[PDB]
Subunit: 470 residues, 4 copies
């Protein structure tokens, strides 16, 4: 009846479902007294959380503003226009010579859409390899079979970097591009701790009449603050994610050039760009249908908050804390790839000690500390990584400082010593299973318990931003 219907769709989750409520409570309690060092995570603001749970979920609309398939979408069109304006003004771009689109759901759909729109199906692709700081959506083909969709539906030839210097090689890149004849140059970055020469990439792309593509998903806030040079001056298409350093919901953005490309030497006809129409026809209904209106408000609020001086101060503090942490780690006796790191994520190398990344990451996880393992440029033993990638994208937002980061570095050093002790006790010839079994030792259990208790007591002082009342 009417009374039973009210208590069904208008009842809080605290008493309706106690399983999901307890799960969320436990997750919040774990993330409140735990230190996170993942270079691809960050806490969102309360405004984004409130905008995500708005009433926009009960609105299924299709089409772009002006040619909507359904009716009564005036507010949706206004919100989309406001979001596009905020996205175009956040990076200080010209609306007449640039375009933005927030229709894709995440980074993968946006990349697949831009591909299907400009990759020329059954063509050739050229991007950075995966082990030398590259993404999976940038081509991953093996000798036996392919895994990534881009490698299954298209042909891609990745290039490696110098294992000694550590920088991306550019001399052989031009020859490989001239001998391969590609149609799109990808410069994705996943673990690279240095910058890239966009001028040479644009020159190589123009030499063969191809296009240049670069994704700023890993470096999104620094580009808006002014710490990292903006790549909107040499690339044709730019994609990014708003769930890394932008402090927003999971969404995708696509930037393209709109205007004249070249001039005709015969008479002088201006060749207009043919990327906006292709991207629009491929993102919808070429790949997906009805977009997510609940994330538009969140991404708009995030883009608006990123324009304030607080965002710039936060980015400056992030880079300062990153430099301090790198210097502290190098002072203890650890080797860092390329010396330092201009970005926030660093690539720590542990090959000098002889311990792989698997056991180190497992122990660091056991001591209530997050981290991600990766391979080093020129690693012979591909089965056991020797790199422990770190990042501080969310620690600064809680209140971490120089002394706090120094204490965290000391804790990491203690964990490394514990890993070395466990490895020497179990032997080097042993496999990973032996290390996992030896980790449960009485002495090792007491040591990891004391370490986790100390790190929890030290991290419990900093607050946890999020949604109150629970």
């Amino acid at each position: 009846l009417w009374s039973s219907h009210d208590k069904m769709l208008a009842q809080p989750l605290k008493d309706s479902d106690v399983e999901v409520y307890n799960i969320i409570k436990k997750e919040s309690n774990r993330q409140r007294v735990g230190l996170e060092l993942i270079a691809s995570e960050n806490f969102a603001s309360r405004a984004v959380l409130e905008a995500l749970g708005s009433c926009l979920n009960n609105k299924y609309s299709e089409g772009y503003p002006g040619q909507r398939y359904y009716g009564g979408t005036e507010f949706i069109d206004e919100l989309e226009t406001l979001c596009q304006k905020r996205a175009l003004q956040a990076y200080k771009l010209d609306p007449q010579c640039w375009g933005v689109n927030v229709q894709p759901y995440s980074g993968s759909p946006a990349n697949f859409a831009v591909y299907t729109a400009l990759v020329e199906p059954h063509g050739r692709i050229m991007g950075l390899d995966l082990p030398d700081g590259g993404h999976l959506t940038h081509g991953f083909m093996t000798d036996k079979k392919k895994i990534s969709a881009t490698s299954i539906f298209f042909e891609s030839m990745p290039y490696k970097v110098n294992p000694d210097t550590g920088y991306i090689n550019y001399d052989q890149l031009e020859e490989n591009a001239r001998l391969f004849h590609p149609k799109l140059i990808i410069a994705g970055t996943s673990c690279y701790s240095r910058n890239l020469e966009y001028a040479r990439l644009r020159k190589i792309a123009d030499e063969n009449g191809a296009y240049l593509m670069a994704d700023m998903a890993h470096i999104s806030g620094l580009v808006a603050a002014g710490v990292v040079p903006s790549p909107f001056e040499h690339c044709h298409v730019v994609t990014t994610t708003t769930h890394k350093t932008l402090r927003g919901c999971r969404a995708g953005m696509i930037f393209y050039r709109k205007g004249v490309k070249s001039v005709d030497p015969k008479t002088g006809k201006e060749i207009l760009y043919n990327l906006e129409s292709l991207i629009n026809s491929a993102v919808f209904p070429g790949l997906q249908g009805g977009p997510h209106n609940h994330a538009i408000a969140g991404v708009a609020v995030a883009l608006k908050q990123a324009m304030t001086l607080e965002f710039k101060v936060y980015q400056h503090q992030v880079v300062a804390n990153c430099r301090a942490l790198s210097e502290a780690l190098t002072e203890l006796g650890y080797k860092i790839v390329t010396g330092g790191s201009d970005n926030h994520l660093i690539l720590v190398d542990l090959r000098s000690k002889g311990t792989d990344g698997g056991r180190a990451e497992k122990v660091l996880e056991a001591c209530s500390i997050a981290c991600n393992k990766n391979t080093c440029p020129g690693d012979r033993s591909a089965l056991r990584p020797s790199g422990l990638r770190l990042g501080t994208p969310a620690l600064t937002s809680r209140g971490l400082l120089e002394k706090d980061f120094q204490k965290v570095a000391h804790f990491i050093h203690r964990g490394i010593e514990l890993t070395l002790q466990i490895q020497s006790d179990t032997g080097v010839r042993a496999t990973l299973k032996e290390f996992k079994e030896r980790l449960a030792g009485d002495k090792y259990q007491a040591a990891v318990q004391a370490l986790r208790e100390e790190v929890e007591s030290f991290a419990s002082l900093f607050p946890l931003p999020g949604l109150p009342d629970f």
Copy 2:
């Protein structure tokens, strides 16, 4: 304390533009009239579970082989969601697999395609102009539009124009020549149902797989009023925002176990679709799964197991039948005789007007609706069918008398449409009709109708946020 104030600033103090936009949208949705089958309201539990700390967690991978560390809570939540989804449709636990990683229907369909189709092979589905979804396949002569036609070779069949029933002998005789590899069973606008037994028999005779799409009738299958397609099907795709009243996500149901026995050696052939379906989603097409969407889907699915959901579905179908008979009593006939589902395809061929004019005039008087190509239509750029449904109306608390009053309102609206049609002209074009739709008397009439429907619907509450 600027950093702490910015990260905790309310929505009303951070940005007022988005707040005012959300308020206006909520008000318009509260006082209005919705008759679209795709539109449906959501509960408050899913809205509260969507926006939480789950967005801060980012860990990609299947339970048991996670790439990151310390994700036992996410694994437990995923296992609970899978168990709930398996126990909802009363499926076999050790013979069916559920996947919730896809973001929506399109990514799930693309994953299933890249997993069990072998690109550039054979594909047979339903035609788009004859009523269907664009993801099922759309290939023309000018240029390809849908990804199914760009990455695969689609070969859809036609439907009967007079009887309106799905033909079978044509596809039966064409499958022996085209040699399809995967059969599609999904329609976006169809009054009748589909015979899954014949489709399964054809798939077994030709040696291929079969997939179904019951998104529109999702809720209808959760109650038990529509024959479950899991009896003679292999792959099933279904969203959670058409009838289930949940967040935007997808559900992929697949069969696991033994397929056939050897004729001589008698060796069982174990299924191998699990590995392919898993590799297609991650790390094949998607990366980090959305934990908030999974939690919302789990809540919306668990809240539909009680008798309340069954009573709601029964009342929905009863009210839909009552509304259909009430509208037909005035003379507006329904194509294909009747409709056993919660959607109706109204046709106004005898009136003379098409579907575009009716949709525009209805949208002008705050009446949600949508057009669609009816069986036997020649004007493809301007169809003549109107898709109507009442899934959200019954969810608000509307009764029989209220629906009768709504029917009277729709009758007055149709009278206004006939008036503007006779005043504009029988030979008027599109632009002329759109510019002449606005009239003094017509403006006053639509204003009075809007005020009346708003005052009548204001007494009914709105689920989700409390008066927000």
Copy 3:
């Protein structure tokens, strides 16, 4: 030392190598005293034989006339132009609205070139199936045409034996093909090119015809000419024209259609596409000897001799069919207007193969069939005979009657052999015991019998060889 080798270098083949010489002599003696009924073979005159062994086998001139890559190729260009003119005039085709290409080496290369020129990689092609007078199954893939391009064949009505245009219309409207193939190898009835042209114009696709079996019939004027409706027509010059193994491609030229909106006229682009796909697409240097042979063959076929030969072929075919029906033998569909005939023996006890083997063992070459309906994996169920093969020697009505009598005697002997071994016998057991003495001497007589019938007529070809 070098002087002694120069003498043997220019020595005849009879003194250089005796093995191949004896092999050629034995093959000639066997084909002279033996008679065949194959429809895919025909004796060639000495003109093409002398032209193939000319000095043109050493010249290497790549490219088309006017765009050659080497120098001193005026004679090659003149010969190619003469061959093109002869081919264009052999079918009364206007040179301003029709083309010709003799670069391909056979029918398969020309067909593949036309396919890659009109159908882009991984395109849609519509053609006739292999069993119903003609290829891709649901298990494996053999034909390269189906490997590089997805093809959807259409079925025909098995009751009346005609192409189902009603179903073909909807099939082409739903599948939306690009190139419709109009060719067959066993279909005795004719084809309606008007319906195919209308379907191609409605769906916006192209039409391709294959007249390799009637290459000569269209030249004489017996069967209708498919050039009035088809766009691209390809054929060979080694089945009916009595020439060498080669191929010819004919394409349309001029204005395709007029657009009232723009006001201009669209011109054909078949010439450029074919020129770019043939060379250097999949072929290198053209065989000048083959061009000279086909040129002299087309020149000799321009006189009334070819027409009277085709008329005599039709008359001999009708006489043979009448003689076969008189002896008590059923003919499938009662013959047709072409030269090939399908003799049915299902009512005698053996559908096919069993009698064909014994016939081949008695100096009587025949061919099987692929008509629908087979108990085993693949049964012929029909004997295909070719009249243009034996008429090239100078046979007449009485000659065909004697051949029919010999065939009847052979069929009776085969029936007796199969009845002596039984019906439950397999193929290997039947082929092993096929050398039974009880009939050996018998067939022996029949053998010399046909021999006495072959030595009386002269065998065409090159003298002294």
Copy 4:
């Protein structure tokens, strides 16, 4: 009796224009000079076996699975040709298989590609403007020309311009990033030699196959002067019209035997390329085989087994060395400082004359030659190299004593083209060049040169059917 005079009629009585054309071609080839490295005259036995009753026989299938009956005589010739091909290059019978069904090199290569590399695969071959064949792979950013680049993906590698040798150091590094399925070891001229050891090593390390195209040096491989690549490559394709003094045909050599052993299971892995090539050849891109071509290649391989073939090859190498030293003595420079095979590539960049102008001038003075791109050029539009050879001259009877005279004639022609270029202009077009070729100031020179070369070439005989 009309059929008697119709079929049994000589070519001279039936046709006249074709007879006159053949006579003119024979007369031009008799008093004309031949220098193309891809042209040669076959023996009289090949021409005699080409035209016979074999052209009237048709049978589709392979020996043992013939679809038509009465083919017992064809199986004998087939096995005889197979045995001759297996014993020509001294190959093991139970270890290698031969195939002579393809018509030419292009269909054979296409069948090998379709049988080894899956459609839309990845292959690596020599680039066309760097000494590679067109059938190996060629494509640009605008469109495609070759069929290999259309139906498959090919990645060509350039050649080192300073050293003049193939940049093998880049192939090993590019194979790990491109992951090819078949390595194409072919070339157009390549005056130098190759090393199949490292190529086979890289091929087995990358898990791919090796297809060597030795059609240009086939005869050399049959003489032992060039290392045979059979003991190092998997598939070997060749022809019989470029060399061996035979007709236009093809020949494929595939490996059949034990590839490798597996210690885990304990069985032995056997080769399977035989079935693949048999299925790709028929029914593949061709239909019925040509018996005349099979008989011609068989008689050619049989005639090449005597000492005459070795003597001819030695004389060809000696003639090539004499021509190279004579051309270098005049003042011309040769690529890589000499040559190893019979063919040579002369460079004229130091002179200042394009390859097209020199080629046209030589062709106008009754001298055969063909231009080609020189290693180090910016493009292939205006080549600067000229490919020369002496197979026909050696087969006719030319000795080393006449090479000095032909070199002097070539030098005179070069001086004439230099004067013409200096008279026409700095950037004169082809129209003005061809117009000035017959100018009053140059008509006497070209006329005297043509008369001299004609009188010098009309002395040696020409092998072939007399009259």
